[PDB]
Paper text:
Bioinformatic analyses indicated the presence of an ∼20-kDa domain near the C terminus of MpIBP that is a member of the PA14 family, which is a carbohydrate-binding lectin module widely distributed across several kingdoms of life. The DcisD motif coordinates a Ca2+ ion that is directly involved in binding polar vicinal hydroxyl groups of various carbohydrates.
Glucose and 2-deoxy-glucose bound the lectin with similar affinity, giving Kdapp values of 1.36 and 1.37 mM, respectively. d-Mannose and methyl-α-d-glucose bound MpPA14 with slightly weaker affinity (Kdapp = 1.7 mM and 2.1 mM, respectively), and the binding of d-allose, 3-O-methyl-d-glucose and d-galactose was significantly diminished to Kdapp values between 4.1 and 6.8 mM. Glucose, GlcNAc, and other glucopyranose-containing carbohydrates, including 2-deoxy-glucose, methyl-α-glucose, and two disaccharides (sucrose and trehalose), all bound to the Mp-PA14-Ca1 via their trans vicinal 3,4-diols (ionic bond length, 2.5 Å) in gauche configuration with a dihedral angle of ∼60°.
Numbering used by the authors: 10 to 191
Write the structure that this text describes.
């Protein structure tokens, strides 16, 4: 049975090799069991300095969500997160606006909707719009990583053409696609 909570299923992975792009982080995910799991219920992380994978920086980055960590990982030079689950969205047009260091990829219903396939200092990107054809829980996954240095990850979403944006949080996230009452 899978835990039902108002969030995405989160996995953290650290490494002492360099993460340069999405494929490097995906290879890390596929190489081993997660160094820690957590519930990603408020997806607005960072900003911090001196490497996400060192010391208590992951805890600081994840903020409130860190109370659901399965373990406190040891030190690594590089690290990142893989999130997967569901997000309630009505039919319509949407776009992400993401502040991040380093890169990331967000996919909904199997289609990339926000991608930065490289390392970067903290930048905000307003991504192109996409459509949701039918209201309900949509499948979503996210990758983000830190190659070292500073780290931040805040992928906000707009339903009104970029006039207002919201964080993905427990109001609309579901780990399994069933309605959470938590
Ligand atoms: O090259 C990207 C790198 O630029 C700067 O060193 C700040 C870092 O956080 C970032 O990872
Ligand atoms: Ca794995
Ligand atoms: Ca630690
Ligand atoms: Ca249908
Ligand atoms: Ca590195
Ligand atoms: Ca960084």
């Amino acid at each position: 049975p899978d835990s039902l909570f108002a969030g995405l299923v989160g996995e953290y992975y650290g490494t002492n090799s360099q993460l340069n792009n999405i494929s490097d982080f995906r290879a890390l995910v596929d190489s081993k069991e997660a160094d820690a799991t957590f519930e990603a219920a408020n997806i607005s992380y960072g900003r911090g300095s001196s490497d996400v994978a060192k010391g208590t920086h992951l805890q600081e980055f994840l903020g409130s969500d860190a109370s659901t960590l399965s373990t406190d990982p040891g030190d690594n030079t590089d690290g990142g997160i893989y999130l997967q689950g569901y997000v309630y969205l009505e039919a319509g047009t949407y776009n992400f606006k993401v502040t991040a260091d380093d890169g990331y990829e967000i996919t909904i219903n199997g289609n990339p909707v926000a991608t930065v396939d490289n390392n970067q200092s903290v930048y905000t990107v307003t991504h192109a719009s996409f459509t949701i054809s039918e209201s309900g829980y949509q499948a979503i996954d996210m990758i983000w990583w830190d190659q070292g240095g500073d780290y931040v990850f805040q992928p906000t979403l707009s339903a009104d053409g970029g006039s207002t944006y919201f964080v993905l949080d427990s109001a609309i996230l579901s780990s399994t696609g069933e309605t959470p009452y938590t």
